[PDB]
Amino acid sequence: DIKRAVVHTHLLNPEWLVNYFGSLSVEDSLECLRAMLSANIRQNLQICVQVASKYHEQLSTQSL
Amino acid sequence: DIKRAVVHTHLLNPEWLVNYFGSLSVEDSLECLRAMLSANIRQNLQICVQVASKYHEQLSTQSLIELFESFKSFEGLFYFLGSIVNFSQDPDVHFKYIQAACKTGQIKEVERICRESNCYDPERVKNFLKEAKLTDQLPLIIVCDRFDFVHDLVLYLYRNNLQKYIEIYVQKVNPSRLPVVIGGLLDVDCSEDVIKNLILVVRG
Amino acid sequence: KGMVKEAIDSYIKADDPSSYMEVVQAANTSGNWEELVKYLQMARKKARESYVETELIFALAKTNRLAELEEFINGPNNAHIQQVGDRCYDEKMYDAAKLLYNNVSNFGRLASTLVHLGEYQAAVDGARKANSTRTWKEVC
């Protein structure tokens, strides 16, 4: 369970996190996003979309 | 009726008001706060808590927290008692801070106090946990083995569901209590293939 | 004065669950396991405790209200089974630990009571899932 960025998102610099997920996403960021959106608070909301404008260009999955 | 700061709070410098209430509170600021919270607008809301982090140190009255939790206490008590878990030894303050953490998901700030605090009754707590079902159960499996009452926890975990709970418990939390948990699983007679598969997990 | 029967109606009109510990201290002093049932049944809705439910199932088994003793447990009991299950065989009120340990799966203690029950077919079915020395030998 590496996925606990839901709490750090209120404090962590999202810029380098976008690249943390641009890397290490061997079919994995889907599940972390699923966890973040299981706690889709208005604070941690748009960050799910800021990342989203990177991976669509390679895989705009219908699962997403 | 000196109490009309509810309207000035939208305009008045709260700093010197904090000291206006640090003085002149001969059992009086309770009623003024009761009036402010009778009009607990989002604007005049946190100011009720900024004052609150001064008078607790002399009198953390249960009347205060009663009139507090009488309302929603969306995150009011979490911010109030977020600074009072330290410098306290009461069971009720810890328990009700934890219960306030159930109102907005801040369980990550609860798992810390289950370890830090050691001056509370976890029995009423874990009962409430199974009543107010945590929904991401993951402190009870920390505070319970912190207090070694696992003989029924293992059973409750098998009863509701077991996808990660025992696995992530022995993996992350404390692998030192695996075989006792297997003793529990064999008391309840879980499937042996599950045990052969579970033991393959790495240890600490 | 020990008016345990009369100390109850002085709480029915109040619904005050407090001091129930002393109510229990006087309850075992005189078998009255029918009206404590009502006291605890309604005080259930006032103090979500565990003593209430434990002593409740104890009184139920005392008055052998099995049809609903088995139903209360199937809900959110939040009680302490195997502590009154101790009282089942300590007082030897069988056909009770049969139901307490059933949904709790304590294979090894139920069979000690099924010794005195008389059933043997399901006793060994409890033992095969126990596979303990005590269980097997006592069933034998």
Q: Does B191 touch chain C (CB under 8 A)?
A: no
Q: Does B168 touch chain A (CB under 8 A)?
A: yes
User: What does the block give as tokens for B184?
Assistant: 């529990």
Helix (H, G, I), strand (E, B) or coil at C11: helix
Per-residue burial over C47-67, b if 16 or more Cβ lie within 10 Å, else e, is eebeebbbbbbbbbbbeebee
The single-letter DSSP state of residue C72 is: H
Biggest CA pair distance of chain A: 31
**Contacting residues of C for B189, CB less than 8 Å apart:** 105, 107, 129-130
Q: Does C83 touch chain B (CB under 8 A)?
A: no
Identify whether the C-beta of residue C30 lies closer than 8 Å to the C-beta of residue C49: no
Q: CA distances (Å), B162 to each of B128, B166, B189, C81, C122, in order?
A: 20, 7, 14, 22, 28
Burial class (CB in 10 A: 0-12, 13-18, 19+), B38: exposed
Top residue of C104, C110, C135 to mutate, by most chain B CBs within 10 Å, is C104
Which helix (H) or strand (E) covers residue B24, if one does? none
Q: Which residues contact B183 (CB under 8 A, 6 or more apart)?
A: none
Q: Does B112 touch chain A (CB under 8 A)?
A: no
Please indicate the experimental technique that yielded this structure: cryo-EM
* Closest C-alpha to A33, from A42, A43, A16, A21: A21
Place of tokens 């599950």: B194
**Å between A59 CA and nearest CA of chain B:** 30
Instruction: Tell me the C-alpha distance between C21 and C27, whole Å.
Output: 10
- Per the CB < 8 Å rule, is B187 touching C108? yes
Looking at residue C131, its amino acid is N
User: What does the block give as tokens for C92?
Assistant: 């030897």
- Residue B168 has its nearest CB partner, among A1, A7, A39, at A1
Q: Does C50 touch chain B (CB under 8 A)?
A: yes
Identify whether the C-beta of residue B105 lies closer than 8 Å to the C-beta of residue B127: no
Q: Does C106 touch chain B (CB under 8 A)?
A: yes
* Closest C-alpha to C68, from C47, C24, C38: C38
**Contacting residues of C for B188, CB less than 8 Å apart:** 105
Helices vs strands, H then E, count in chain A: 5, 0
Identify whether the C-beta of residue B125 lies closer than 8 Å to the C-beta of residue B96: no
Helix (H, G, I), strand (E, B) or coil at C114: helix
Do C and A make contact via 3 or more CB pairs under 8 A? The reply is: no
User: What does the block give as tokens for B66?
Assistant: 């009663």
Radius of gyration of chain B (CA): 22
Q: Which residues contact B18 (CB under 8 A, 6 or more apart)?
A: B50, B51, B54
**Contacting residues of B for C76, CB less than 8 Å apart:** 130-131
User: What does the block give as tokens for B70?
Assistant: 């009488």
- Per the CB < 8 Å rule, is B105 touching A39? yes
* Closest C-alpha to C101, from C120, C88, C116, C117: C88
- Per the CB < 8 Å rule, is C78 touching B131? yes
Identify whether the C-beta of residue B195 lies closer than 8 Å to the C-beta of residue B185: yes
For chain A, the chains sharing at least 3 beta-carbon pairs closer than 8 angstroms are: B
**B41 alpha-carbon distance from chain centroid:** 25
**Contacting residues of A for B172, CB less than 8 Å apart:** 1
Instruction: Tell me the C-alpha distance between B150 and C43, whole Å.
Output: 29
- Per the CB < 8 Å rule, is A4 touching B172? no
**Contacting residues of B for C104, CB less than 8 Å apart:** 155
B11 φ/ψ angles, rounded to the nearest 5 degrees: -135, -20
Q: Does C104 touch chain B (CB under 8 A)?
A: yes
SS3 content of chain C, % helix, strand, coil (to 5): 55, 0, 45
Instruction: Tell me the C-alpha distance between B16 and A57, whole Å.
Output: 56
**Contacting residues of B for A2, CB less than 8 Å apart:** none
The CA-to-CA distance between both ends of chain A, in Å, stands at 20
Angle, CA of B198, B201 and B203, to the nearest 5°: 120
Identify whether the C-beta of residue B47 lies closer than 8 Å to the C-beta of residue B16: no
Angle, CA of B5, B10 and B12, to the nearest 5°: 65
Instruction: Tell me the C-alpha distance between B21 and B16, whole Å.
Output: 9
Burial class (CB in 10 A: 0-12, 13-18, 19+), C115: middle
**Contacting residues of B for A1, CB less than 8 Å apart:** 164, 168, 172
Helix (H, G, I), strand (E, B) or coil at C82: coil
User: What does the block give as tokens for C67?
Assistant: 């049809």
Q: Does B195 touch chain C (CB under 8 A)?
A: no
User: What does the block give as tokens for B146?
Assistant: 């912190």
SS3 content of chain B, % helix, strand, coil (to 5): 60, 0, 40
Helix (H, G, I), strand (E, B) or coil at A59: coil
**B75 alpha-carbon distance from chain centroid:** 11
